[PDB]
Amino acid sequence: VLLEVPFSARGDRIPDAVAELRTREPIRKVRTITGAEAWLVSSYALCTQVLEDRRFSMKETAAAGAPRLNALTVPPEVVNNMGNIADAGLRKAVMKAITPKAPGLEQFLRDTANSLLDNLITEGAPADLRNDFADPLATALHCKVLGIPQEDGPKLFRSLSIAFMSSADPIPAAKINWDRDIEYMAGILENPNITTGLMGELSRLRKDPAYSHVSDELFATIGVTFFGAGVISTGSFLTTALISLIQRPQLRNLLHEKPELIPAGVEELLRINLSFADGLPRLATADIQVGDVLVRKGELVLVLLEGANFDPEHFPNPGSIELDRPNPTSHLAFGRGQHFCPGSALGRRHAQIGIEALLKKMPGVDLAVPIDQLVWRTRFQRRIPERLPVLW
Ligand code: HEM
Ligand SMILES: Nc1n[nH]c(-c2ccc(O)cc2)c1-c1ccc(O)cc1
């Protein structure tokens, strides 16, 4: 049969297959889990082209009858969430509220990381660094950034193992959790105690005359989607970064010894990250030449981030973490172009502070199981181990 995507849910190694495709056929046809055909793009040059040409549309991926990567877990209008935010005149305000720059926010991240780590040391090895460190760090950060109660984090988080599924078919639970989580965020907008963070800001703008015709549904949706995307993305990235560090003891020791190099190491950890389980989907809105292929209007294109980020033509010795590259932020871990991640700085800070805190508290961190014993989540939009058992 035609080559099927994805190739592997493992987030600890890139398949050899990826370099062979990039060399032989850096754009080629594949079949997705729904049985649709798509073009898989796997070189830095071609990934960048697709991402920088808006005629490859994000929004149009949601059109009825399109070839699909996977089934929607959001309303179709939510695929255009950033466009809807810009159209409501809310982009600057949202972007400002999710920077890691608010007074106290970095200290709160540090404090939270340290407390989680003290609790694991009290309890004794083995510790699970996903469920008991990275994901609670992510969840606490996002409650603080949104201005919502910390104690509401866990129930919101538990929606995410369904919300970020990569399924061939619609998921009944996704609707149940979406509607419940929208109702919660609508209640937050009406709650006078919520005066800080992204929700406190949205709540003020909602009652300002310049935003009187912005819908209550959009305001709630921003809350739900920014919580879910940020939590899943920071928690998953930090988890798989910790694997890459733990398996580079020389690097772990360098960063421990010289923590000022942590921002450069996180940037390399981003470059090499396999967190995104699928290419980023786009729908062609015109006939467009990409390499040796004429992509036709209506066809699905999948931009393979690791294809670009491990391309030796751009990043020589791609599989090695080198802290002195001349082009260190030029990876595609946060995307490129119109839909460049709005949370990028926040994501970087979360990882930096989590890593700094772990290396200080557990300088001897190591896996407590052979690496092949990690259980990789399937049929999900992220690659993540179900547990990350460590000792120190
Ligand atoms: C290390 C952490 C993160 C990584 C690796 C990541 C990665 C990405 C990538 C690759 C995209 C582009 C998707 C595409 O073009 O199809 C994206 C978009 C997005 N990110 Fe992130 N992200 C992270 C953190 C965050 C955070 C913290 C938030 C929010 C608080 C966030 C919110 C979103 C949203 C809302 C979009 C969609 C933007 C659009 O539709 O134009 N991300 N992210
Ligand atoms: N691609 C996705 N899969 N699942 C979601 C999502 C986010 C939060 C939820 O509670 C439910 C689904 C998304 C999502 C997240 C952020 C967006 O701007 C648009 C879509």
JSON list of N, CA and C in Angstrom, two decimals, residues 242-294:
[
{"chain": "A", "resi": 242, "resn": "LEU", "atom": "N", "xyz": [13.47, 16.49, 28.78]},
{"chain": "A", "resi": 242, "resn": "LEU", "atom": "CA", "xyz": [14.11, 15.88, 29.90]},
{"chain": "A", "resi": 242, "resn": "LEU", "atom": "C", "xyz": [14.71, 14.50, 29.48]},
{"chain": "A", "resi": 243, "resn": "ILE", "atom": "N", "xyz": [14.03, 13.70, 28.64]},
{"chain": "A", "resi": 243, "resn": "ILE", "atom": "CA", "xyz": [14.55, 12.42, 28.12]},
{"chain": "A", "resi": 243, "resn": "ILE", "atom": "C", "xyz": [15.84, 12.73, 27.41]},
{"chain": "A", "resi": 244, "resn": "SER", "atom": "N", "xyz": [15.85, 13.70, 26.50]},
{"chain": "A", "resi": 244, "resn": "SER", "atom": "CA", "xyz": [17.05, 14.01, 25.68]},
{"chain": "A", "resi": 244, "resn": "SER", "atom": "C", "xyz": [18.15, 14.47, 26.56]},
{"chain": "A", "resi": 245, "resn": "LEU", "atom": "N", "xyz": [17.95, 15.20, 27.60]},
{"chain": "A", "resi": 245, "resn": "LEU", "atom": "CA", "xyz": [18.98, 15.60, 28.55]},
{"chain": "A", "resi": 245, "resn": "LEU", "atom": "C", "xyz": [19.48, 14.44, 29.33]},
{"chain": "A", "resi": 246, "resn": "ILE", "atom": "N", "xyz": [18.56, 13.61, 29.85]},
{"chain": "A", "resi": 246, "resn": "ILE", "atom": "CA", "xyz": [18.95, 12.46, 30.71]},
{"chain": "A", "resi": 246, "resn": "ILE", "atom": "C", "xyz": [19.80, 11.56, 29.91]},
{"chain": "A", "resi": 247, "resn": "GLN", "atom": "N", "xyz": [19.59, 11.39, 28.61]},
{"chain": "A", "resi": 247, "resn": "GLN", "atom": "CA", "xyz": [20.45, 10.53, 27.83]},
{"chain": "A", "resi": 247, "resn": "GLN", "atom": "C", "xyz": [21.73, 11.13, 27.23]},
{"chain": "A", "resi": 248, "resn": "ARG", "atom": "N", "xyz": [21.99, 12.34, 27.68]},
{"chain": "A", "resi": 248, "resn": "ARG", "atom": "CA", "xyz": [23.27, 13.09, 27.39]},
{"chain": "A", "resi": 248, "resn": "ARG", "atom": "C", "xyz": [23.85, 13.58, 28.65]},
{"chain": "A", "resi": 249, "resn": "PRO", "atom": "N", "xyz": [24.39, 12.62, 29.45]},
{"chain": "A", "resi": 249, "resn": "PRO", "atom": "CA", "xyz": [24.94, 13.00, 30.66]},
{"chain": "A", "resi": 249, "resn": "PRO", "atom": "C", "xyz": [26.06, 14.16, 30.77]},
{"chain": "A", "resi": 250, "resn": "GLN", "atom": "N", "xyz": [26.87, 14.16, 29.72]},
{"chain": "A", "resi": 250, "resn": "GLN", "atom": "CA", "xyz": [27.93, 15.17, 29.50]},
{"chain": "A", "resi": 250, "resn": "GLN", "atom": "C", "xyz": [27.25, 16.63, 29.43]},
{"chain": "A", "resi": 251, "resn": "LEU", "atom": "N", "xyz": [26.11, 16.67, 28.67]},
{"chain": "A", "resi": 251, "resn": "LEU", "atom": "CA", "xyz": [25.33, 17.87, 28.54]},
{"chain": "A", "resi": 251, "resn": "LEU", "atom": "C", "xyz": [24.62, 18.26, 29.81]},
{"chain": "A", "resi": 252, "resn": "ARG", "atom": "N", "xyz": [23.96, 17.28, 30.48]},
{"chain": "A", "resi": 252, "resn": "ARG", "atom": "CA", "xyz": [23.33, 17.48, 31.74]},
{"chain": "A", "resi": 252, "resn": "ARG", "atom": "C", "xyz": [24.32, 18.05, 32.71]},
{"chain": "A", "resi": 253, "resn": "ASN", "atom": "N", "xyz": [25.53, 17.49, 32.72]},
{"chain": "A", "resi": 253, "resn": "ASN", "atom": "CA", "xyz": [26.57, 17.98, 33.67]},
{"chain": "A", "resi": 253, "resn": "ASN", "atom": "C", "xyz": [27.06, 19.38, 33.31]},
{"chain": "A", "resi": 254, "resn": "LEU", "atom": "N", "xyz": [27.19, 19.66, 32.02]},
{"chain": "A", "resi": 254, "resn": "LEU", "atom": "CA", "xyz": [27.57, 21.02, 31.56]},
{"chain": "A", "resi": 254, "resn": "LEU", "atom": "C", "xyz": [26.56, 22.13, 31.98]},
{"chain": "A", "resi": 255, "resn": "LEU", "atom": "N", "xyz": [25.27, 21.82, 31.78]},
{"chain": "A", "resi": 255, "resn": "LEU", "atom": "CA", "xyz": [24.23, 22.73, 32.13]},
{"chain": "A", "resi": 255, "resn": "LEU", "atom": "C", "xyz": [24.11, 22.87, 33.60]},
{"chain": "A", "resi": 256, "resn": "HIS", "atom": "N", "xyz": [24.33, 21.75, 34.29]},
{"chain": "A", "resi": 256, "resn": "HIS", "atom": "CA", "xyz": [24.33, 21.83, 35.78]},
{"chain": "A", "resi": 256, "resn": "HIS", "atom": "C", "xyz": [25.48, 22.78, 36.26]},
{"chain": "A", "resi": 257, "resn": "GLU", "atom": "N", "xyz": [26.62, 22.62, 35.65]},
{"chain": "A", "resi": 257, "resn": "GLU", "atom": "CA", "xyz": [27.86, 23.34, 36.06]},
{"chain": "A", "resi": 257, "resn": "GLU", "atom": "C", "xyz": [27.80, 24.82, 35.67]},
{"chain": "A", "resi": 258, "resn": "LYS", "atom": "N", "xyz": [27.17, 25.12, 34.51]},
{"chain": "A", "resi": 258, "resn": "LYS", "atom": "CA", "xyz": [27.10, 26.46, 33.88]},
{"chain": "A", "resi": 258, "resn": "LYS", "atom": "C", "xyz": [25.66, 26.73, 33.41]},
{"chain": "A", "resi": 259, "resn": "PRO", "atom": "N", "xyz": [24.75, 27.01, 34.37]},
{"chain": "A", "resi": 259, "resn": "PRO", "atom": "CA", "xyz": [23.36, 27.21, 34.08]},
{"chain": "A", "resi": 259, "resn": "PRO", "atom": "C", "xyz": [23.07, 28.39, 33.16]},
{"chain": "A", "resi": 260, "resn": "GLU", "atom": "N", "xyz": [24.05, 29.29, 32.92]},
{"chain": "A", "resi": 260, "resn": "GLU", "atom": "CA", "xyz": [23.85, 30.37, 31.97]},
{"chain": "A", "resi": 260, "resn": "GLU", "atom": "C", "xyz": [23.74, 29.83, 30.53]},
{"chain": "A", "resi": 261, "resn": "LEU", "atom": "N", "xyz": [24.14, 28.58, 30.30]},
{"chain": "A", "resi": 261, "resn": "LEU", "atom": "CA", "xyz": [24.03, 28.00, 28.96]},
{"chain": "A", "resi": 261, "resn": "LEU", "atom": "C", "xyz": [22.64, 27.26, 28.78]},
{"chain": "A", "resi": 262, "resn": "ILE", "atom": "N", "xyz": [21.82, 27.27, 29.77]},
{"chain": "A", "resi": 262, "resn": "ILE", "atom": "CA", "xyz": [20.52, 26.62, 29.68]},
{"chain": "A", "resi": 262, "resn": "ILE", "atom": "C", "xyz": [19.70, 27.20, 28.54]},
{"chain": "A", "resi": 263, "resn": "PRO", "atom": "N", "xyz": [19.61, 28.50, 28.32]},
{"chain": "A", "resi": 263, "resn": "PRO", "atom": "CA", "xyz": [18.81, 29.01, 27.19]},
{"chain": "A", "resi": 263, "resn": "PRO", "atom": "C", "xyz": [19.33, 28.47, 25.92]},
{"chain": "A", "resi": 264, "resn": "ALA", "atom": "N", "xyz": [20.63, 28.39, 25.65]},
{"chain": "A", "resi": 264, "resn": "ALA", "atom": "CA", "xyz": [21.13, 27.76, 24.42]},
{"chain": "A", "resi": 264, "resn": "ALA", "atom": "C", "xyz": [20.81, 26.26, 24.34]},
{"chain": "A", "resi": 265, "resn": "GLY", "atom": "N", "xyz": [20.92, 25.61, 25.48]},
{"chain": "A", "resi": 265, "resn": "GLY", "atom": "CA", "xyz": [20.57, 24.15, 25.47]},
{"chain": "A", "resi": 265, "resn": "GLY", "atom": "C", "xyz": [19.10, 23.99, 25.22]},
{"chain": "A", "resi": 266, "resn": "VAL", "atom": "N", "xyz": [18.22, 24.78, 25.79]},
{"chain": "A", "resi": 266, "resn": "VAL", "atom": "CA", "xyz": [16.76, 24.64, 25.48]},
{"chain": "A", "resi": 266, "resn": "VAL", "atom": "C", "xyz": [16.49, 24.91, 24.07]},
{"chain": "A", "resi": 267, "resn": "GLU", "atom": "N", "xyz": [17.18, 25.83, 23.36]},
{"chain": "A", "resi": 267, "resn": "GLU", "atom": "CA", "xyz": [16.94, 26.09, 22.04]},
{"chain": "A", "resi": 267, "resn": "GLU", "atom": "C", "xyz": [17.33, 24.86, 21.16]},
{"chain": "A", "resi": 268, "resn": "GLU", "atom": "N", "xyz": [18.43, 24.22, 21.45]},
{"chain": "A", "resi": 268, "resn": "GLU", "atom": "CA", "xyz": [18.78, 22.95, 20.80]},
{"chain": "A", "resi": 268, "resn": "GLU", "atom": "C", "xyz": [17.76, 21.81, 21.11]},
{"chain": "A", "resi": 269, "resn": "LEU", "atom": "N", "xyz": [17.31, 21.79, 22.32]},
{"chain": "A", "resi": 269, "resn": "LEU", "atom": "CA", "xyz": [16.28, 20.78, 22.72]},
{"chain": "A", "resi": 269, "resn": "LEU", "atom": "C", "xyz": [15.00, 21.02, 21.92]},
{"chain": "A", "resi": 270, "resn": "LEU", "atom": "N", "xyz": [14.67, 22.28, 21.70]},
{"chain": "A", "resi": 270, "resn": "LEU", "atom": "CA", "xyz": [13.56, 22.59, 20.80]},
{"chain": "A", "resi": 270, "resn": "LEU", "atom": "C", "xyz": [13.83, 22.12, 19.42]},
{"chain": "A", "resi": 271, "resn": "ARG", "atom": "N", "xyz": [15.00, 22.39, 18.81]},
{"chain": "A", "resi": 271, "resn": "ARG", "atom": "CA", "xyz": [15.34, 22.01, 17.50]},
{"chain": "A", "resi": 271, "resn": "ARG", "atom": "C", "xyz": [15.16, 20.49, 17.32]},
{"chain": "A", "resi": 272, "resn": "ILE", "atom": "N", "xyz": [15.64, 19.70, 18.26]},
{"chain": "A", "resi": 272, "resn": "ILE", "atom": "CA", "xyz": [15.64, 18.26, 18.11]},
{"chain": "A", "resi": 272, "resn": "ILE", "atom": "C", "xyz": [14.32, 17.64, 18.58]},
{"chain": "A", "resi": 273, "resn": "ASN", "atom": "N", "xyz": [13.37, 18.40, 19.01]},
{"chain": "A", "resi": 273, "resn": "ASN", "atom": "CA", "xyz": [12.16, 17.80, 19.70]},
{"chain": "A", "resi": 273, "resn": "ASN", "atom": "C", "xyz": [11.27, 17.14, 18.71]},
{"chain": "A", "resi": 274, "resn": "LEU", "atom": "N", "xyz": [10.82, 15.95, 19.17]},
{"chain": "A", "resi": 274, "resn": "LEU", "atom": "CA", "xyz": [9.84, 15.14, 18.42]},
{"chain": "A", "resi": 274, "resn": "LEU", "atom": "C", "xyz": [8.46, 15.21, 19.00]},
{"chain": "A", "resi": 275, "resn": "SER", "atom": "N", "xyz": [8.08, 16.19, 19.73]},
{"chain": "A", "resi": 275, "resn": "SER", "atom": "CA", "xyz": [6.80, 16.30, 20.39]},
{"chain": "A", "resi": 275, "resn": "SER", "atom": "C", "xyz": [5.64, 16.27, 19.40]},
{"chain": "A", "resi": 276, "resn": "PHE", "atom": "N", "xyz": [5.73, 16.93, 18.27]},
{"chain": "A", "resi": 276, "resn": "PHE", "atom": "CA", "xyz": [4.59, 16.93, 17.32]},
{"chain": "A", "resi": 276, "resn": "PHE", "atom": "C", "xyz": [4.53, 15.64, 16.62]},
{"chain": "A", "resi": 277, "resn": "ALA", "atom": "N", "xyz": [3.42, 14.89, 16.83]},
{"chain": "A", "resi": 277, "resn": "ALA", "atom": "CA", "xyz": [3.29, 13.57, 16.27]},
{"chain": "A", "resi": 277, "resn": "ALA", "atom": "C", "xyz": [2.95, 13.49, 14.78]},
{"chain": "A", "resi": 278, "resn": "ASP", "atom": "N", "xyz": [2.39, 14.54, 14.25]},
{"chain": "A", "resi": 278, "resn": "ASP", "atom": "CA", "xyz": [2.02, 14.63, 12.86]},
{"chain": "A", "resi": 278, "resn": "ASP", "atom": "C", "xyz": [2.58, 15.87, 12.20]},
{"chain": "A", "resi": 279, "resn": "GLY", "atom": "N", "xyz": [2.78, 15.84, 10.92]},
{"chain": "A", "resi": 279, "resn": "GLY", "atom": "CA", "xyz": [3.07, 17.09, 10.20]},
{"chain": "A", "resi": 279, "resn": "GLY", "atom": "C", "xyz": [1.98, 18.09, 10.48]},
{"chain": "A", "resi": 280, "resn": "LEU", "atom": "N", "xyz": [2.31, 19.40, 10.31]},
{"chain": "A", "resi": 280, "resn": "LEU", "atom": "CA", "xyz": [1.35, 20.44, 10.45]},
{"chain": "A", "resi": 280, "resn": "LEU", "atom": "C", "xyz": [0.48, 20.46, 9.13]},
{"chain": "A", "resi": 281, "resn": "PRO", "atom": "N", "xyz": [-0.86, 20.41, 9.24]},
{"chain": "A", "resi": 281, "resn": "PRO", "atom": "CA", "xyz": [-1.65, 20.31, 8.04]},
{"chain": "A", "resi": 281, "resn": "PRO", "atom": "C", "xyz": [-1.98, 21.69, 7.46]},
{"chain": "A", "resi": 282, "resn": "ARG", "atom": "N", "xyz": [-2.04, 21.71, 6.15]},
{"chain": "A", "resi": 282, "resn": "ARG", "atom": "CA", "xyz": [-2.48, 22.87, 5.37]},
{"chain": "A", "resi": 282, "resn": "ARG", "atom": "C", "xyz": [-3.24, 22.34, 4.15]},
{"chain": "A", "resi": 283, "resn": "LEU", "atom": "N", "xyz": [-4.18, 23.14, 3.63]},
{"chain": "A", "resi": 283, "resn": "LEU", "atom": "CA", "xyz": [-4.92, 22.76, 2.42]},
{"chain": "A", "resi": 283, "resn": "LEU", "atom": "C", "xyz": [-4.51, 23.71, 1.31]},
{"chain": "A", "resi": 284, "resn": "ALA", "atom": "N", "xyz": [-4.11, 23.22, 0.15]},
{"chain": "A", "resi": 284, "resn": "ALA", "atom": "CA", "xyz": [-3.79, 24.09, -0.97]},
{"chain": "A", "resi": 284, "resn": "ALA", "atom": "C", "xyz": [-5.03, 24.78, -1.45]},
{"chain": "A", "resi": 285, "resn": "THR", "atom": "N", "xyz": [-4.98, 26.10, -1.68]},
{"chain": "A", "resi": 285, "resn": "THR", "atom": "CA", "xyz": [-6.00, 26.90, -2.23]},
{"chain": "A", "resi": 285, "resn": "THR", "atom": "C", "xyz": [-5.74, 27.33, -3.69]},
{"chain": "A", "resi": 286, "resn": "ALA", "atom": "N", "xyz": [-4.71, 26.82, -4.27]},
{"chain": "A", "resi": 286, "resn": "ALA", "atom": "CA", "xyz": [-4.34, 27.08, -5.62]},
{"chain": "A", "resi": 286, "resn": "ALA", "atom": "C", "xyz": [-3.42, 25.92, -6.07]},
{"chain": "A", "resi": 287, "resn": "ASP", "atom": "N", "xyz": [-3.03, 25.81, -7.36]},
{"chain": "A", "resi": 287, "resn": "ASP", "atom": "CA", "xyz": [-2.08, 24.87, -7.86]},
{"chain": "A", "resi": 287, "resn": "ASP", "atom": "C", "xyz": [-0.74, 25.53, -7.59]},
{"chain": "A", "resi": 288, "resn": "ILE", "atom": "N", "xyz": [0.15, 24.90, -6.85]},
{"chain": "A", "resi": 288, "resn": "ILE", "atom": "CA", "xyz": [1.44, 25.51, -6.40]},
{"chain": "A", "resi": 288, "resn": "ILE", "atom": "C", "xyz": [2.57, 24.49, -6.54]},
{"chain": "A", "resi": 289, "resn": "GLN", "atom": "N", "xyz": [3.69, 24.80, -7.20]},
{"chain": "A", "resi": 289, "resn": "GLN", "atom": "CA", "xyz": [4.81, 23.98, -7.38]},
{"chain": "A", "resi": 289, "resn": "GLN", "atom": "C", "xyz": [5.61, 23.95, -6.10]},
{"chain": "A", "resi": 290, "resn": "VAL", "atom": "N", "xyz": [5.84, 22.75, -5.56]},
{"chain": "A", "resi": 290, "resn": "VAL", "atom": "CA", "xyz": [6.66, 22.49, -4.35]},
{"chain": "A", "resi": 290, "resn": "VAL", "atom": "C", "xyz": [7.64, 21.43, -4.72]},
{"chain": "A", "resi": 291, "resn": "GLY", "atom": "N", "xyz": [8.91, 21.81, -4.91]},
{"chain": "A", "resi": 291, "resn": "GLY", "atom": "CA", "xyz": [9.85, 20.87, -5.41]},
{"chain": "A", "resi": 291, "resn": "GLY", "atom": "C", "xyz": [9.53, 20.33, -6.77]},
{"chain": "A", "resi": 292, "resn": "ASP", "atom": "N", "xyz": [9.60, 19.01, -6.91]},
{"chain": "A", "resi": 292, "resn": "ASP", "atom": "CA", "xyz": [9.22, 18.34, -8.14]},
{"chain": "A", "resi": 292, "resn": "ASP", "atom": "C", "xyz": [7.74, 18.04, -8.22]},
{"chain": "A", "resi": 293, "resn": "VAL", "atom": "N", "xyz": [6.87, 18.53, -7.31]},
{"chain": "A", "resi": 293, "resn": "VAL", "atom": "CA", "xyz": [5.44, 18.19, -7.34]},
{"chain": "A", "resi": 293, "resn": "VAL", "atom": "C", "xyz": [4.65, 19.46, -7.56]},
{"chain": "A", "resi": 294, "resn": "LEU", "atom": "N", "xyz": [3.66, 19.40, -8.42]},
{"chain": "A", "resi": 294, "resn": "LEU", "atom": "CA", "xyz": [2.63, 20.40, -8.60]},
{"chain": "A", "resi": 294, "resn": "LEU", "atom": "C", "xyz": [1.51, 19.99, -7.65]}
]
